[PDB]
Design a binder for this molecule. Structure first.
Ligand SMILES: Cc1cc2nc3c(=O)[nH]c(=O)nc-3n(C[C@H](O)[C@H](O)[C@H](O)COP(=O)(O)O)c2cc1C
Ligand code: SF4
Ligand code: SF4
Ligand code: SF4
Ligand code: FES
Ligand code: FES
Ligand SMILES: [K+]
Lengths: 429, 263, 87, 43, 213
């Protein structure tokens, strides 16, 4: 294929995205969840890991690592420690809200995914870390887990397969950084949400100092379907190395901001117009898009005209797919203020552990604040570019990268707006 | 037999498995710059001053924490390495207070000296600086926490060496603060050692306050007699007066610590 | 933490009396060697220099820190006391 | 078959201890936990 | 706003706090969720539980959690000051949390903040004199397609207009508890004015299943 989009509803995985059907066990089973789960568990981890590899599934938490190879780090003989699957339901990236819909409307996909994914990893239990603000969502997930226990689908002798598996839910307490995979582990252990250095990698030393895999909610919740319908089925959607379906969030200045499932590699223009009702004020009223959540660099309208929504297409546009959260800004937006407010967000979420982000992000924030008013000189723009490059690649975790990239996108595509603002301040003073 | 070969600026060196990049560098006599790393504490990897380029690796690695792999070539003076140090030093100094004349660390300050040797020679920071309130932790250790660079050495020392878990960090981000949260005195027989290991003038000897500068002191290597451990010490004197007592490193006796009574 | 002042061998002499000058209180001395410090590449060079000059001397073996076993992973041990309670 | 109604209305009646009551109810179903071998790292 | 504690008559080690018998049973279930030898993993849920009983965390509440789990008090202090959901000062009966990050800013969350302030007569970060409402700004609450939105305690209120939020507040004062969710006509996150997908009845068990499974 060379064209993507127009995903058929028979090919949509999250068939209860909008919560118009019973989310509890009876509704989930009637839609195809928990079907032949024993047979999947009896095929063994190597077969399960084989399907995931053949599917071309990539991490849906924002980094997009190939899932089959990542999960295979856990397929090693036991050294005596317990093994765990940690499901990352922190869902903290601004613009992102797809994992919220799975947890409250398709919780039994996530629970079954935890079992199927945990079997492939050899885990004994799954810890689902869910942000503390998602209290009602966490309560729904907990009711679904109880249903799954009472039906024998999880627990001792799960699905009758002879495999023991537990599913714990542990709530967060308000921290974007706790979505980072090793900060999440540190939080489950009762410490501050400060990321770990690597190595060790979690597959060797993770939660409680044990073999551990952290997987995104969307990543785990699709694993049972990939196994039932085949990795070949999943790989048949999207471009090569960009396989599958994807949950998109379209927010900002669109007519009908929404969450939808669509084929990977759909054009950004097609996605905004078909599902979100188009850009407020028309397509020509578009100024810029943030394609993959606040951490990804913005792209201007000229780039949005033809860009495809997948990992490799957006990297060539000098940004990334990220969580696939699309924040649209129309021509009435103060683009400098919009990005400045994202830098303020990163200033509030920095764990403060490491120097470049503890000091640098707060420094970038003060500079962006003056750029909004124009109270600066054009020489400071290149100074700000160099500052962001001293943070990127020098910090412990990717939050420092996630703060530098939005600034670089703004300077990359909107330098004349920044300079014009400085020129205006110079006259009025 | 178990040793692996790595290169430091292209020089072959044989190290045990688990040896860090930082440890490999010291075998050929190079000392990687550091703030948070201390050889007697647990690795932290938060200051980032020790970042170093590995040849053919696009990303600089924290030398203090990263184990070296076979065949690695550590580039301790490449442009990538030097620029990482300059950027990190710039971040450390952005909010650091202009206190050197009134600060007791001046003249024997790792922040001063590593700024001279690895940092830039000027500033491009144009904002206001952070200011932090002081914490009272007893009559021995004066705190000027605006100078703290959040290296967590004192926290690790108190927990691991002294076995006291009363120090930590509160808050988040640029506002993260080292201290006790509550009003608490850090009185431990080994407490005065946090003065030595604090790289900056954040933690200083209250008795020593303002009395001397390091360059004018004469150093007399001697022995403690306040107990029978025989801790090795340095007696600092100036113009015929004893000014203070410092630990002298002895691996088989006191390592690099002394008790409060000795100090 | 810098180790650059522990590379070379030093020769110094025994400390003698310093007293307060009656006029100003400055530190007075009658020891012509009070400030004499000599540097040497090796202890053997220093010993050689002391012997030909006729000085009685003491030699103290160089103390070098012993190599330590550091592991960042040990901070999170499943079942050992090296697990840290904070970062 | 109907699409026109929201069917996730149970959380209009959740309360302060809903989540913690569910976890308490789940306790009887959990497998025995693994043991590090000591009361805590400080033992 | 401050991350250092100072004893006051209202907040000190002697400020009375203890879990009720029912919350001790809830605590036992929490601790049992983690491996033996790693009870410090219960600090966040138990500290959150202290807050749900008490409404906020006095220092003595923090000291009690440290005692029950046998962890140094400083380690609990670190958690309480790191995570923004813990209240180290008393808040009103209704903690109004207005999201003001860019996606919500782009859909006029500022108008929501302004209406709440005019209605309650307070500023951001203040409690009303009746001690019923506390108003703060927060970062992305993960409901961006439903911007502008607020959280009041555990409930989300979505797709708000300045009239809608005042109606929610008027209900709260009266003692009624308003229904969470969008106030615009849609139920959740579907596009407004018509579903663009998931309009056909979902397939049943065994659809599209590969051969051999
Ligand atoms: C600051 C920060 C926040 C993150 N938040 C999340 C998150 O909320 N959900 C998520 O799945 N991944 C998040 N990640 C990415 C995780 O670190 C990790 O890549 C992901 O959980 C891996 O799972 P996956 O491969 O299935 O995507 C975050 C990363 C950073 C640096
Ligand atoms: S980059 Fe920021 S969030 Fe990540 S460890 Fe460093 S200070 Fe913490
Ligand atoms: S700690 Fe060092 S750099 Fe900072 S004021 Fe004191 S002497 Fe100067
Ligand atoms: S007080 Fe000193 S030793 Fe402690 S964290 Fe700050 S700089 Fe490091
Ligand atoms: S010395 Fe390595 S990061 Fe601090
Ligand atoms: S930006 Fe407000 S909910 Fe995400
Ligand atoms: K000091």
């Amino acid at each position: 294929k060379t064209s993507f989009g127009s995903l058929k509803d028979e090919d949509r995985i999250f068939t209860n995205l909008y919560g118009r059907h019973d989310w509890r066990l009876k509704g989930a089973q009637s839609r195809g969840d928990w079907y032949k789960t024993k047979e999947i568990l009896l095929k063994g981890p190597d077969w399960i890991l084989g399907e995931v590899k053949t599917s071309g599934l990539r991490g849906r938490g924002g980094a997009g690592f190939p899932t089959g190879l990542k999960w295979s780090f856990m397929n090693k003989p036991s050294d005596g420690r317990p093994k765990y699957l940690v499901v990352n339901a922190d869902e903290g990236e601004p613009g992102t809200c797809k994992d919220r819909e799975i947890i409250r409307h398709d919780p039994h996909k996530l629970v079954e995914g935890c079992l199927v994914g945990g079997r492939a990893m050899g885990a004994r239990a799954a810890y689902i870390y869910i942000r503390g603000e998602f209290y009602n969502e966490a309560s729904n997930l907990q009711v679904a887990i109880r249903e799954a226990y009472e039906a024998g689908l999880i627990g001792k002798n799960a699905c009758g397969s002879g495999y023991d598996f537990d599913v714990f839910v542990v709530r967060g307490a308000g921290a974007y950084i706790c979505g980072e995979e090793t900060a999440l582990i540190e939080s489950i252990e009762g410490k501050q949400g400060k990321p770990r250095l690597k190595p060790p990698f979690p597959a060797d030393v993770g939660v409680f100092g044990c073999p551990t895999t952290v997987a995104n909610v969307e990543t785990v919740a699709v694993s049972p379907t990939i196994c039932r319908r085949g990795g070949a089925w999943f790989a048949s959607f999207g471009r090569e190395r960009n396989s599958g379906t994807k949950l998109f969030n379209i927010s900002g200045h669109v007519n009908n901001p929404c969450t939808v499932e669509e084929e990977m590699s759909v054009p950004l223009k097609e996605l905004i117009e078909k599902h979100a009702g188009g850009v407020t004020g028309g397509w020509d009223n578009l100024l810029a898009v943030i394609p993959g959540g606040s951490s990804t660099p913005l792209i201007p309208k000229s780039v949005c005209e033809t860009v495809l929504m997948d990992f490799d297409a957006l990297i060539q546009a000098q940004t990334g797919l990220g969580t696939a959260a699309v924040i649209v800004m129309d021509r009435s937006t103060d683009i400098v203020k919009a990005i400045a407010r994202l830098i303020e967000f990163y200033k509030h979420e920095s764990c403060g552990q490491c120097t470049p982000c503890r000091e640098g992000v707060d420094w970038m924030n003060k500079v962006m604040a003056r750029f909004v008013r124009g109270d600066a000189r054009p020489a400071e723009i290149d100074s700000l570019w160099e500052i962001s490059k001293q943070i990127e690649g020098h910090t412990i975790c990717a939050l420092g990268d996630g703060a530098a990239w939005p600034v670089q996108g703004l300077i990359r595509h909107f330098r004349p707006e920044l300079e014009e603002r400085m020129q205006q301040f110079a006259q009025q003073h | 037999s178990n040793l692996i070969e790595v290169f430091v600026d292209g020089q072959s060196v044989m190290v045990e498995p688990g040896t860090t990049v930082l440890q490999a560098c010291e075998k050929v006599g190079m000392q990687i710059p550091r703030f948070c790393y201390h050889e007697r504490l647990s690795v932290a990897g938060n200051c980032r001053m020790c970042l170093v380029e590995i040849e053919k690796a696009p990303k600089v690695v924290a030398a203090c924490a990263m184990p070296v792999m076979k065949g690695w070539n550590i580039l301790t003076n490449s442009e990538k390495t030097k620029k990482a140090r300059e950027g990190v030093m710039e971040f450390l100094l952005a909010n650091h207070p202009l206190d050197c004349p009134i600060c007791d660390q001046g003249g024997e300050c790792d922040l001063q000296d590593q700024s001279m040797m690895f940092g830039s020679d000027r500033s491009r920071f144009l904002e206001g600086k952070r200011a932090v309130e002081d914490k009272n932790i007893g009559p021995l250790v004066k705190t000027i926490m605006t100078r703290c660079i959040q290296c967590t050495r004192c926290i690790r020392f108190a927990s691991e060496i002294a076995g006291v878990d009363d120090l930590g960090t509160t808050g988040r981000g640029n506002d993260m603060q080292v201290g006790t949260y509550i009003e608490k005195m850090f009185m431990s027989e080994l407490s005065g050692n946090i003065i030595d290991i604090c790289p900056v003038g954040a933690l200083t000897s209250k008795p020593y306050a303002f009395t001397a500068r390091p360059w004018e002191t004469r150093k007399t290597e001697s022995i403690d007699v306040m107990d029978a451990v025989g801790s090795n010490i340095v007696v600092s004197t100036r113009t015929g007066e004893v000014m203070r007592i410092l630990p002298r490193m002895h691996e088989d006796i006191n390592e690099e610590w002394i008790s409060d009574k000795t100090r | 933490s810098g180790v650059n002042n522990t590379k070379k061998w030093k020769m110094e002499f025994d400390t003698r009396e310093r007293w307060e000058n009656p006029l100003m209180g400055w530190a007075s001395t009658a020891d012509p060697l009070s400030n004499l410090v000599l540097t040497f590449s090796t202890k053997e060079d220093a010993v050689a220099f002391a012997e030909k000059n006729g000085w009685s001397y003491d030699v103290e073996e160089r103390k070098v820190p012993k190599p330590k076993s550091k592991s960042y992973g040990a901070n999170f041990s499943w079942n050992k006391r090296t697990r840290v309670s904070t970062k | 078959f109907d699409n026109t109604t929201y069917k996730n209305l149970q959380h209009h009646d959740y309360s302060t201890y809903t989540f913690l009551d569910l976890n308490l109810d789940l306790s009887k179903f959990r497998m025995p936990q693994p043991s590090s071998g000591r009361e805590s790292p400080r033992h | 706003a401050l991350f250092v504690h100072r004893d006051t008559p209202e907040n000190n080690p002697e400020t009375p706090f203890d879990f009720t018998p029912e919350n001790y049973k809830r605590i036992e279930a929490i601790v049992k969720n983690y491996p033996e030898g790693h009870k410090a993993a219960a600090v966040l849920p138990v500290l959150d539980l202290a807050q749900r009983q008490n409404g906020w965390l006095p220092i003595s509440a923090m000291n009690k959690v440290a005692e029950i789990l046998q962890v140094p008090p400083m380690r609990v202090y670190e958690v309480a000051t790191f995570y923004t959901m813990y209240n180290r000062k008393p808040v009103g009966k209704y903690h109004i949390q207005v999201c003001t990050t860019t996606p919500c800013m782009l859909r006029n969350s500022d108008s929501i903040l302004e209406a709440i302030q005019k209605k309650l007569g307070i500023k951001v970060g203040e409690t009303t004199p009746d001690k019923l409402f506390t108003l703060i700004e927060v970062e992305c609450l993960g409901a961006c397609v439903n911007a502008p939105m607020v959280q009041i305690n555990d409930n989300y209120y979505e797709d708000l207009t300045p009239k809608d939020i005042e109606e929610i507040i008027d209900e709260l004062k009266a003692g009624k508890i308003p229904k969470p969710g969008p106030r615009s006509g849609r139920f959740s996150c579907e596009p407004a004015g018509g579903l663009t997908s998931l309009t056909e009845p979902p397939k049943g068990p065994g659809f599209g299943v590969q051969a051999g499974l």
